[PDB]
Write a protein that binds this ligand. Structure first.
Ligand SMILES: CC(C)=CC(=O)SCCNC(=O)CCNC(=O)[C@H](O)C(C)(C)COP(=O)(O)OP(=O)(O)OC[C@@H]1O[C@H](n2cnc3c(N)ncnc32)[C@@H](O)[C@@H]1OP(=O)(O)O
Ligand SMILES: CC(C)=CC(=O)SCCNC(=O)CCNC(=O)[C@H](O)C(C)(C)COP(=O)(O)OP(=O)(O)OC[C@@H]1O[C@H](n2cnc3c(N)ncnc32)[C@@H](O)[C@@H]1OP(=O)(O)O
Ligand SMILES: CC(C)=CC(=O)SCCNC(=O)CCNC(=O)[C@H](O)C(C)(C)COP(=O)(O)OP(=O)(O)OC[C@@H]1O[C@H](n2cnc3c(N)ncnc32)[C@@H](O)[C@@H]1OP(=O)(O)O
Ligand SMILES: O=CCCCC[C@@H]1SC[C@@H]2NC(=O)N[C@@H]21
Ligand SMILES: O=CCCCC[C@@H]1SC[C@@H]2NC(=O)N[C@@H]21
Lengths: 91, 82, 541, 520, 520, 56
């Protein structure tokens, strides 16, 4: 009510942690602030066969990739490349 | 039991009512005090407590001194054996 | 056969009209002011206090609430403006406490968190009133209560307004015990050092979670112990997580830090063995046919002008479908059936001055809704007496009371929203704060008082003049003017929505664009409790 | 066989002792002060207002109450000191309203009468609070409500305080409707002009009685002959009171008791010795067993767990033949005392016996060892036990009441049926002098943390205002000016007041008690 | 959001350790012994009796049960070892009767079938006790009762033991009538000749099925065509079972659950490791958390008050998607353990959650200091809390159970829905060696009081019989020969047995729990 | 029991007697010290009433 909710989440890329501030916009898009740069992100998850795909647009650039979330690692598979991101484990 | 005889048969050694400060002591190191005479007055809470002599015998020793802290149910006045 | 086509309410407003533009401008200004004030309140107690709180390793209360609730779930904060300018020189952002309704492990729960940055978590009278209101809401709706206890006890100054009376601090423990006895779960998370008042809260809670080092439960603090008995002891030794968990046994769970405590709280809520069941019928939800932002132009900020409440109804109901009841009888009052997010609701709105026919129609509609077990929604826009000085109001008294009683005796969930003025007995008739609605909200342009300032000024001048005439003292004509100007100013300042929100009356102010969402959340929360039978008193006539 | 001889409590005090004389002198002075203040309050609004009220042909409110109740029946007035010096320059004798419990046609009823002489019957915030308290008492005890009405409506000054709040002037109508739904009767007599929109009060009442000319719910002739709001037409005040008595007689109500009864016997010792026994100094301690022995039938008391947690006294007795469970304070509360009180409260709730609390509490014992043994835990479960109890609870404050001890011993926040205080009582969050030490230490430490220096003289100067303020707030009159604590009572009348209160409270049936989780 | 990752209990044991190997060997030997004894019991009454029974055209009782229940459905037999060596020279395999819980037409029902091969179906006292226990289980869980009947009536030897007592052979009819009154169905199939006055069992049943020639209630033709006692006529055993299935299908009953449900997940560790973990020696101690981790869904456990009274383990888990409150023993019981157990039991009763007790108790802590702190008081309130609980209670004895600890942890006397024991359990009033010392001291002191002299050798000789006798009585088989303890169970099947028991017990609704006075 | 009455000297409440305590843990204690009217009334709190003898 009368405020915008911002969520602080930490994602470990390689050996260095990264902190991301996510803002839940009213229209349904998200504004993520990483370091001093901000990105406008929107997308959805659609499943083809048994594979789940993520279609998203980042700052007006749209892309699709297969999304796999196994254990505390996030796998993003795409023609451009493959990305692995590790979710930190609570102590 | 109707005559309150069992009520009389109750005795115990002197003890601190609670944990708090002893403001003053009426019993010296060696003194003759009858039962009921005030030994010390203690203020641990909002109220104040005066300690009466459990027995008429002479006090052997005083365990605590003014401004000190007396733990709950701890002896304060030592009475010489009769 | 549910296919049956049905006419829809509402009409397209004229955007080009200058009146629409002016109303939109005024409402936009009011909403921007509200948003900026809410931002400043959300800032917290202060920069130095926040820095110290973070340095002690603790989480800020809003961060605690964000981590506690389910990811992405909306949070319905209550009384954000409590204590706004309530005291002359002391600033109490949010009243020093945070209360709201959110979903924890798929269960709607009421959350009460102390803001340690505001006066070290000390309880102002407004803080006690806010906590009592939250507890009452939870008890009425049968919602589990979660306490994030970090407080310094009652504010030592102003003790008379916090300790002694019935609605003072002890009512907190009373409500806790009663709700525990009624199978409404109580969970206390000692996230910081409590005090004598704070210590009792975890003791009465069914389940306790205490942080290893920050959490400290002592019935009397070190300074308080020294004052009472002259005893010196460290805070951790007197009260600490390890001690309470291992020897005293007060603590029920041991948490390493704030995140661990919140995770344990989520697990504890999960192991409640509770399932929500609905009594009312449900239908698929559909959005209204018109944009909500047009309400700014439709309503505006001037109470003198009148707007059709049917527009407001059409912009907040599912599919803009409304079934009016007794449309042509007592047309100053609007009643009918609609659905919000699939929930049946009976809407009772004001379209003008209340008359005998309007009161009878409202009584009939309330009886119908109570019989059918349908939640009631009141939209109040009581009118000033500038148009009609008396209108033989004696007739209104005989019939106004019938509605006041019918409203009071109703047992269905009642939610009141004040979209305009609310004066006199009309406030009582349309489910005022005194009649225990489940929730009460006001728009930023609302005004509430016993009567309008101009009307009140005239009444005072006449009474004094007549009494003086019997006394034989001439009452100066200039004196009547002198009395009128201050009274008008006082009534305007007192009637302000922020004045009413500073006191815990009228929960919080809501942006008109969010009315549908707020009502949906409120009704979803209120539907947890079963709907009881309604017993009515003796209806005169 | 009820003939077995039972030992009786109490002992004869030493009248010759100087301490007894001093305590008696102080208590007598306090009681005389209370009596004179009550007389002045009973005088009414003023001489000119009373003269005008009589010239209008109406009866004074106290005369109305006297004529309404049965001849010779006692009247239990409530909150006589409401509004005493509450406002800076305005005098509101009795809060502008009169409330009490009396017998009408053999039925105990709650009577609420407006005093038209005080500001023309306008409702101050204290008046609204007093009326709400009376209505709550009537609802809890299932007593019929009689509202003699002579109201000028809400006092326009301080309108925000009374018209808007949930607990403020809208609750009066809500309570009236709910009482009617529960079959508790609501009867309204319009003995005076309802100039404001107070027309609702008779309209919501089940039965109305309106006087021919003074009554103006806007015309009495228009209302009596045409509006029909009026269910009865009265020529004057006496006729209205007679009609009210007849209406109450036509209620078809019979009082039935659930608790057992025994023949009543007077206590074995005079009540006036309580003045010497208790005195006026809170520092000295007196045995509560004397007070119990001077207010129970035959001075017969059956102590429960006498030697365990001796700082708390619990047992069974009978007042006017009514069984009662007495819970009194004899010192600081400890874990054993809290457990013993919990045990006794559970027993009383199980057996459906009314509870009576005598408060002389000075706080909860505080210490590292006490915290280790869960003193807070015992306090809480004892408090919970008190809150969850459904038997009639009456609290009497005979001395100090501070801290969580007030909550433990059925404070005002825990909804006792009645609450009374004697003239020597002091109520506050904590004692004044200790309160002073705590504030100074927090400020001195905060300065040390930030590198600021706190002067010793400044700390002492800060403490002095706190000491004076705490004493003024604790005064019994200050508490009774607000509606906290019902009315200050003369210790000599404690037995009569308790008997009347229990007789009134026994009207409602005793429900089953459900307890929350007992933290072991 | 139920995704929240949660830590899981349990750890991987060291297989290479010699202690694990020895414990596994001992437990495997015990389980093999149990399996072979159960096989011999399942063999039946005897070869000649079985041959005659088959020659008569009837079906063996186990074949009857197999054909009655749904295809492939598990069957939970109860008290397989009843009568095992109970009588000196007479062999009574299974007590002469067969009882269990199975699914008939999708409905869980209690089945009681007489074994005609054992003494012609005559009722031994153990048979009556077993049937009464089965009827009590069915009544508590609201399960329909099916009584295949092939009885020769009361065994004339030991007639005084069975016919006269309140809990002896007259209660069987009383239970049947009460179950019918409460709407719990009673169905009787006369698959065999009722030579004695067992005609009452079908007559009191709501529905009867009698076989054409074998079944007598004295002629089947006379009863079916004329007496009318018969409500159904069956050509043979298979037809009777088919008719019974149809009758059960025509019951118009639907099972509804009150507790919440979640998807079932298997434990994270193999069950057979319990053999090594627990072993067969009661002197060694094992962590009950391992046993909990090997029998709960996903090995997820939420411990409650972990660090307070650590000798007792309490927490929340789920078995087959059913919420359960686990209360296990990890050592000697103390005051803190008793208080923690009382708190947990109160919580479970408030939330309406079934309770599971794992008994490894060795007694209550005894000592002067312990008596000073009311160890008996804390034991009493846990004993009370357990007794007053109304939620379904299932007790499993995984080790020793002695003294008041048996009563505290939901012993057989406190009416658990089911009770099971593992092969290593020993049950007695106290340990045998301890009993030995106590008896000798009392006799020696009594001699000293009367001036008699007690020889040291005589005291030691008195102790030796006590030591041997206690061991024989404590053996698990001795307890299961009597109907105490239902059936001995293989630890590998503990999860399945508990799941079946809870599924059966969830048929009845969960009532509110009323507690007595908590002696704080 | 809801209410207890224990005689001053004859009454002795111990969860385990002196011989039983010695057998279980090898502890020696007198019967009155382990369980007695005064102890239960004053420290353990098990006793609810204190009686001088049988008639009382
Ligand atoms: C229920 C019943 C029946 C009875 C009771 O409950 S009787 C309770 C008695 N209270 C205590 O016994 C707690 C005493 N506090 C402390 O022991 C600590 O202080 C903490 C624990 C509060 C943590 O706070 P902290 O120490 O970490 O920081 P601090 O800045 O010092 O916190 C702000 C500073 O507290 C001052 N302050 C003013 N009023 C109070 C107040 N009522 N309580 C505490 N502090 C207060 C504030 O004025 C100053 O700041 P300011 O206004 O000067 O800027
Ligand atoms: C419920 C809701 C939802 C709304 C409402 O209820 S909105 C109600 C609006 N009220 C009226 O509409 C009644 C207006 N009174 C009158 O019509 C009459 O006055 C009577 C009927 C009161 C009889 O009284 P009276 O006329 O016989 O004598 P009077 O001496 O004149 O009586 C005292 C004098 O009244 C002054 N006075 C001050 N405050 C008030 C006040 N609030 N109401 C009345 N009078 C007041 C007092 O200050 C002065 O005396 P003082 O203080 O100067 O010495
Ligand atoms: C409820 C109330 C209030 C009262 C009553 O109920 S008063 C009931 C009176 N009983 C009868 O009236 C049934 C008399 N039986 C018969 O009419 C038959 O026998 C049948 C029907 C039992 C079928 O059995 P069967 O005839 O087909 O074979 P059989 O081998 O003969 O069966 C075993 C042999 O029965 C001997 N045997 C020992 N004790 C009994 C016993 N109590 N009842 C029956 N038989 C018994 C056994 O010792 C021998 O074998 P064994 O031990 O020598 O090897
Ligand atoms: O009357 C003197 C002491 C009362 C306050 C002592 C503190 S304040 C709150 C806490 N609870 C108590 O009852 N005592 C302590
Ligand atoms: O298993 C060992 C026996 C200890 C329990 C026997 C009961 S329990 C309480 C009492 N105290 C004892 O030592 N024995 C009895």
């Amino acid at each position: 009510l009368n405020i915008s909710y911002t969520r602080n989440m930490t994602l470990k890329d390689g050996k260095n942690n990264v902190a991301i501030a996510v803002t839940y916009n009213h229209d349904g898009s998200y504004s993520m602030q990483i370091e001093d740069k901000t990105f406008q992100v929107l997308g959805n998850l659609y499943s083809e066969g048994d594979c789940t795909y993520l279609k998203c647009s980042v700052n007006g650039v749209a892309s699709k990739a297969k999304l796999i979330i196994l254990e505390n690692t996030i796998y993003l598979f795409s023609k451009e490349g493959s990305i692995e991101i590790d979710i930190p484990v609570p102590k | 039991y109707l005559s309150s005889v069992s009520s009389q048969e109750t005795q115990g050694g002197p003890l601190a009512p609670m944990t708090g400060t002893i403001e003053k002591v009426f019993v010296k190191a060696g003194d003759k005090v009858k039962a009921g005479d005030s030994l010390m007055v203690m203020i641990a809470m909002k109220m104040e407590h005066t300690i009466k002599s459990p027995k008429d015998g002479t006090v052997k020793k005083v365990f605590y001194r003014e401004g000190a802290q007396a733990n709950r149910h701890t002896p304060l006045v030592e009475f010489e054996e009769e | 056969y549910h296919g049956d086509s049905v006419a829809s309410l509402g009409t397209q407003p004229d955007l080009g009209s200058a009146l629409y533009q002016e109303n939109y401008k005024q409402m936009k200004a009011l909403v921007n002011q509200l948003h900026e004030r809410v931002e400043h309140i959300k800032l917290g107690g202060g920069e130095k206090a926040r820095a110290l709180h973070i340095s002690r390793g603790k989480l800020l209360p809003r961060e605690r609430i964000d981590n506690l609730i389910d990811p992405g779930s909306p949070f319905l904060e209550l009384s954000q403006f409590a204590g706004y300018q309530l005291y002359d020189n002391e600033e109490v952002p949010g009243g020093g406490i945070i209360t709201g309704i959110g979903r924890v492990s798929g269960v709607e729960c009421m959350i009460i968190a102390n803001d340690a940055t505001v006066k070290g978590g000390a309880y102002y009278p407004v803080t006690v009133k806010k906590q009592l209101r939250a507890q009452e809401i939870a008890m009425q709706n049968r919602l589990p209560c979660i306490y994030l206890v970090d407080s310094g006890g009652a504010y030592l100054p102003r003790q008379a307004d916090v300790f002694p009376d019935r609605d003072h601090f002890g009512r907190t423990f009373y409500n806790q015990a009663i709700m525990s006895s009624k199978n409404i779960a109580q969970i206390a998370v000692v996230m910081g050092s409590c005090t004598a008042g704070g210590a009792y809260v975890p003791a009465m809670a069914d389940e306790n979670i205490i942080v290893r080092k920050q959490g400290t439960i002592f019935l009397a603090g070190p300074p308080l112990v020294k004052a009472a008995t002259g005893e010196e002891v460290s805070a951790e030794d007197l009260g600490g997580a390890d001690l309470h968990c291992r020897k005293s046994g007060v603590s029920d769970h041991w948490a390493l830090d704030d995140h661990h405590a919140l995770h344990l709280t989520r697990k504890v809520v999960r192991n409640l063995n509770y399932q929500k069941k609905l009594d009312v019928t449900i239908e698929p939800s559909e959005e209204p046919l018109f944009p909500a932002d047009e309400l700014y132009g439709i309503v505006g900020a001037n109470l003198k002008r009148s707007f059709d409440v049917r527009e407001v109804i059409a912009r907040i109901v599912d599919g803009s479908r409304f079934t009016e009841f007794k449309a042509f009888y007592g047309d100053t009052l609007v009643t009918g059936f609609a659905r919000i997010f699939g929930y049946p609701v009976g809407i009772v709105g004001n379209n003008g001055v209340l008359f005998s026919e309007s009161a009878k129609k409202g009584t009939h509609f309330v009886q119908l809704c109570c019989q059918r077990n349908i939640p009631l929604l009141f939209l109040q826009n009581i009118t000033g007496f500038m148009v009609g000085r008396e209108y033989e109001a004696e007739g209104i008294a005989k019939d106004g009371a019938k509605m006041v009683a019918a409203v009071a005796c109703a047992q269905v969930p009642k939610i009141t929203l004040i979209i305009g003025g609310s004066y006199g007995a009309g406030n009582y008739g349309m489910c005022g704060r005194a009649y225990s609605p489940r929730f009460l909200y006001i728009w930023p342009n609302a005004r509430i008082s016993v009567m309008g300032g101009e009307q009140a000024a005239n009444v005072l001048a006449t009474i004094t003049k007549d009494q003086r005439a019997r006394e034989g003292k001439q009452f100066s004509s200039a004196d009547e003017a002198a009395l009128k100007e201050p009274i008008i100013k006082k009534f305007e300042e007192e009637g302000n929505p922020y004045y009413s929100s500073a006191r815990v009356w009228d929960d919080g102010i809501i942006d008109p664009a969010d009315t549908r969402l707020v009502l949906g959340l409120s009704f979803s929360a209120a539907l947890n409790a079963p709907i009881e039978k309604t017993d009515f008193g003796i209806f005169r006539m």
